[PDB]
Amino acid sequence: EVETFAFQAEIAQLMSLIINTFYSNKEIFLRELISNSSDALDKIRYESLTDPSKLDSGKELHINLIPNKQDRTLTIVDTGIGMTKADLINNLGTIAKSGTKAFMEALQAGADISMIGQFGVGFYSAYLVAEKVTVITKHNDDEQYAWESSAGGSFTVRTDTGEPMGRGTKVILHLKEDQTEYLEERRIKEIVKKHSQFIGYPITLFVEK
């Protein structure tokens, strides 16, 4: 049972600008997704300060980076607060319509693309390197769901029957054919050290066979 939704016109426009604009500094996608994970971890930590049972779904607060060269995927896993189905449909828990407007007004006033995260829409920088993005998420108050989009104006949401997650979010980047440098250990390490070296949660880069 798969539900298909249209992106709001402003989000479709942002996504097409990310995909079509010539812009060589693609590595910022990983900074933005790690930042989103750190925000999601801060939220479940804050909730747990007054209600410890919010961590019954998992006490460890961390970020894992999982490259898979056979599948040509880079997966960013966090054990943050996760998203409900309603959150997924509402632009993955963002204020993407007003954020896109503020981002585009900022660019007209002298910002560049790499400030995208300041406007709350850093998630969509995934499309700098991915032809398809899958988001698996589990929030304490809802069931496990899978969101998916190859851009083109639409996304799908379905109940996820895969590996139970406990709590958190998994962003699976199905990489473009010419973007496989982001699966190499030395390249990922370089980017994490350059852009994410002070994130307050452990970031573990998995290795492959």
> Which of residues 23 and 201 has its CB atom nearest to ligand A1AX2 in the complex?
23
Does the annotation list 20 as a binding residue? no
Least distance (Å) between residue 57 CB and ligand A1AX2: 35
Q: Give the Cα separation of 53 and 38 in Å (integer).
A: 20
Helices 28-50 and 185-195 cross at an angle (nearest 10°) of 60
By CB under 6 A, residue 61 contacts ligand A1AX2: no
Residue ranges of E strands in the chain: 2-6, 63-68, 73-78, 130-138, 145-149, 154-159, 168-175, 203-205
Does the annotation list 36 as a binding residue? yes
Does the annotation list 119 as a binding residue? no
Least distance (Å) between residue 172 CB and ligand A1AX2: 21
- Conformational region of residue 164, where left means phi above 0, alpha means psi within -120 to 50, and beta covers everything else: beta
Least distance (Å) between residue 84 CB and ligand A1AX2: 28
Closest among 156, 152, 149, 155 to 133, alpha carbons compared: 149
The DSSP bridge pattern shows strands 130-138 and 145-149 to be antiparallel
Among 12, 17, 89, 95, the residue binding ligand A1AX2 under the rule CB under 6 A is 17
> Which of residues 124 and 145 has its CB atom nearest to ligand A1AX2 in the complex?
124
By CB under 6 A, residue 111 contacts ligand A1AX2: no
Amino acid code (one letter) for 13: Q
Among 10, 12, 16, 23, the residue binding ligand A1AX2 under the rule CB under 6 A is 23
> Residue positions in the annotated binding site for ATP?
36, 78, 97, 123
Residues that bind ligand A1AX2 (CB under 6 A): 14, 17-18, 21, 23, 104, 107, 113
